[PDB]
């Protein structure tokens, strides 16, 4: 079964798409074409991203597909069948959802892992690099995998850092420590 499962509808579409292109052994091709069709959809904002509104016909939906494969003739072919499927199931409206989902699945296959270093305010680039080095070095990143570490700004977390990746976290923050500290002196 394809590594990394995607629960629920729209990601069942992604799961299918990946495994279908995995047996064709043309996943990179799929990914590239998916980025391209998503991009030219996204870059056509009014009329063709804001006319993904759910109200179009069966026949009009088919013709939206025909315009999409008119827009560029470079598509994997599995993803040309996928366009048909989403139209046919008339769930075409969620288009980008499947795209994003295929992306999540894909870059897991590629090996890339994503992390997060939430903090109160943005932290140093020196800190970013030191943490990135450490985190990549650690056994947590198995290696043969990469870490796109993203600092995000969350004011709610007061100071510190929280490392997140692999649904495994180490939370050493002042807000979290303060919570536990306060609690212990209210006993």
């Amino acid at each position: 079964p394809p590594p990394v499962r995607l629960f629920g509808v729209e990601g069942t579409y992604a799961t299918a798409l990946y495994q279908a292109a995995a047996k064709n052994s043309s996943i990179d091709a799929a990914f590239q074409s998916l980025q391209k069709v998503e991009s030219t959809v996204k870059k056509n904002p009014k009329l063709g991203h804001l006319l993904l509104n759910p109200a179009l016909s069966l026949k009009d939906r088919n013709s939206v597909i025909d315009a999409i494969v008119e827009t560029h003739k470079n598509l994997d072919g599995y993803v040309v069948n996928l366009l048909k499927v989403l139209s046919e199931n008339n769930r075409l409206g969620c288009f980008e959802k499947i795209a994003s989902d295929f992306g999540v699945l894909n870059d897991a296959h590629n090996g890339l892992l994503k992390g997060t270093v939430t903090s109160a305010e943005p932290l140093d680039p020196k800190s970013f690099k030191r943490i990135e080095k450490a985190l990549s070095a650690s056994k947590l990143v198995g290696q043969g995998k990469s870490l796109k570490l993203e600092n995000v700004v969350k004011p709610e977390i007061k100071g510190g850092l929280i490392v997140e990746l692999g649904d495994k976290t180490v939370d050493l923050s002042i807000s979290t420590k303060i919570q536990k500290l306060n609690k212990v002196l209210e006993d």
């Binding site: 002042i174 420590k177 303060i178 500290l181 002196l185």
Partner: protein
């Protein structure tokens, strides 16, 4: 770290506030004496009672 900061601040910068033993007294029940020995006083002294009793109830044993 934060632990140290808290430790430092808490211990050093404030301690107990005032509180007097005298104020405590109001909120507790204070010792008071067990007044009175409570001496009982002799009753029925003398044959005054006896003469009265012999005479008063003459009801014989049956």
């Amino acid at each position: 770290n934060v632990i140290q900061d808290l430790y430092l601040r808490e211990l050093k910068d404030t301690k107990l506030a005032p509180s007097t033993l005298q104020d405590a007294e109001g909120n507790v029940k204070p010792w008071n004496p067990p007044q009175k020995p409570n001496l009982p006083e002799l009753e029925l002294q003398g044959p005054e009672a006896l003469k009265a009793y012999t005479e008063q109830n003459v009801e014989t044993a049956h």
